[PDB]
């Protein structure tokens, strides 16, 4: 009766402060075994990786009918320990953060949890692909994975070749981050940046027999966010920027804050291994 | 290192009456405790090539739980074959998903018979292990031939379901004998709702790098032969302001190919089904 997931496994890792994380990693369904994958294969990172393992799992899976399929890649879902629910709303409060001096407890932990991904996550799951070598790697995160993901750019260029920013939340902490993109810009192989969110998030409608003042409350929020303004506020200042490679912005049509997640993360994962190296910007 | 499991979720084997296997693979909401947590009417969407879509339509259907549209969601269900180290079966669906006609060469033209297992079969087998829940709607979702499955289901047993979502109908098949239906189904005569969505690079494909023009020629040549979007928009016109159709949603996925599209266009589909019913009228 129950269903069993083909060409993949999950671990348990312990960072430096003691705190479980789960590693789902998968590998392209062909495959007979692991080993079976051999040469440079690209890879992705995927923080709240219980919210998007199987969709960047299948998708990738998926691919294997395109015609421009390239062999695929590696999809490794950084997650917690959970059950009944896709999100650890304490542990990703402080792990995909920045540190700031006026952030709340509980809050700022975004280096931690980025040396933890190269100092263990990585060498790790290298190891369970001996014969495979790492041809290039990528980071995705949505919302506040998202701005661990620009943060990881601006203060580490170097750590990855590809960042994948899913709908990111600039507007945390009064805008903290753009701090870190003017310094980034300021300063004298670059790696590229994919921006995306979703045009319901600023501007969303009005349901069906939706009440005026539910309605009113979720235009009020949506102009706090400032998802969409903000977004294009980054990409208007990293324009022309020595420091990075190319710079992709899209505004899919039609989604909100949730919906957007299986769009971003597909096409992350897409263009990312059939389509690398991306156009100059 | 353990395999990967996969919660809140069931497979099983039925077999139509021909003694052709199926694996019929079930989830439902991540924040039950388990089956049997699900009481009251809940809507149900059935996935055709099922085993290429069941994940992403399951994460997606638990992801809307913390969405502000969330209405408890609903039921997954994914019709898929005996597969390993691939998504499809192209000879079982081949026959499965295209409609009955005197030219169809031999292996296709197996729609009906497909389409009244799942009615006879499938419908029931889901609804025995949920004996407390009601199904308060029904939904088909199909992707290529599994879109020329739900138009064909649409047109020829518009009682069958409630809602009809067909991902980028191959409506091309066969000298476009699906026209044929569409014709006879607005000519004639609670209605059923109709989703149809297409991506934008599967008529008008871009170039890919250190692409040969010849090859790039060759792809546009075969893009413009299939007819994706044209073919979609002249459908639609045909169905537009008919009686029998409650609603119609086109949808146009920007820079979306035939594969890519299917992670937009299952995600919509089963959350537009779950949260936003009643569509509005059209
Ligand atoms: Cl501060
Ligand atoms: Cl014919």
């Given at each position: 009766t129950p269903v069993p997931l083909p060409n993949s496994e999950q671990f348990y890792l312990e960072n430096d402060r003691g705190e479980p994380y789960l590693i789902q990693v998968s590998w392209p369904?062909?495959?007979?075994?692991?080993?079976?994958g051999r040469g440079p294969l690209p890879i992705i990172y995927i923080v709240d990786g219980n919210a998007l393992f199987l969709t960047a799992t299948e998708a990738a899976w998926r691919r294997?009918?395109?015609?421009?399929?390239?062999?695929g890649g590696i999809i490794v879902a950084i997650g917690y320990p959970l059950?009944?629910?896709?999100?650890?709303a304490r542990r990703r409060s402080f792990d995909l953060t920045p540190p700031t001096?006026?952030?709340?407890?509980?809050?700022?932990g975004a280096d931690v949890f980025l040396d933890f991904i190269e100092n263990s996550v990585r060498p790790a799951v290298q190891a369970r692909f001996p014969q495979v070598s790492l041809a290039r790697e990528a980071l995705y995160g949505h919302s506040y994975g998202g701005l661990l993901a620009l943060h990881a750019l601006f203060t580490?260029?170097?750590?990855?070749?590809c960042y994948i920013a899913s709908?990111?939340?600039?507007?945390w902490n009064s805008l903290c981050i753009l701090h870190e993109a003017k310094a980034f810009v300021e300063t004298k192989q670059s790696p590229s940046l994919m921006v995306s969110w979703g045009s319901w998030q600023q501007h969303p409608p009005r349901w069906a027999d939706e009440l005026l003042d539910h309605y009113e409350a979720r235009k009020r929020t949506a102009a706090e966010l400032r998802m969409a303004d903000n977004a294009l506020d980054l990409c208007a200042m990293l324009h022309g920027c020595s420091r990075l490679h190319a710079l992709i912005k899209t505004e899919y049509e039609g989604e909100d804050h949730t919906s957007v997640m299986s769009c971003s993360v597909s096409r992350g994962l897409t263009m990312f291994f059939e389509d690398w190296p991306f156009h100059q910007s």
């Open positions: 369904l062909h495959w007979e075994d692991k080993q079976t294997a009918a395109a015609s421009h399929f390239a062999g059950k009944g629910k896709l999100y650890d001096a006026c952030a709340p407890v509980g809050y700022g580490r260029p170097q750590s990855f070749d709908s990111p939340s600039i507007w």
